[PDB]
Amino acid sequence: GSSGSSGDEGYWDCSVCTFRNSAEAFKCMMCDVRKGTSTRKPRPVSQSGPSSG
Ligand SMILES: [Zn+2]
């Protein structure tokens, strides 16, 4: 189709509307559905205290 990488390639294929979105685009453009999972690992967490005894 087109030849000439302006910045950085990496288009992601949406799942909700199955539309083609560009990497630069934070979220979808067709359905506008958020893609950034932003999931939190089940890893443990404790109160942040003094690193040094
Ligand atoms: Zn979409």
Swiss-Prot record:
Complete-protein stretch covered: 19 to 58 of 180
Domain of life: Eukaryota
Subunit composition and interactions: Interacts with MYC, MYCN, RNF2/RING1B and YY1. Part of the E2F6.com-1 complex in G0 phase composed of E2F6, MGA, MAX, TFDP1, CBX3, BAT8, EUHMTASE1, RING1, RNF2, MBLR, L3MBTL2 and YAF2.
Organism of derivation: Homo sapiens
GN (gene name): YAF2
Protein name, per record: YY1-associated factor 2
Locations listed in the record: Nucleus
Zinc finger (RanBP2-type): 8-37
TM region(s), chain numbering: none
Role played: Binds to MYC and inhibits MYC-mediated transactivation. Also binds to MYCN and enhances MYCN-dependent transcriptional activation. Increases calpain 2-mediated proteolysis of YY1 in vitro. Component of the E2F6.com-1 complex, a repressive complex that methylates 'Lys-9' of histone H3, suggesting that it is involved in chromatin-remodeling.
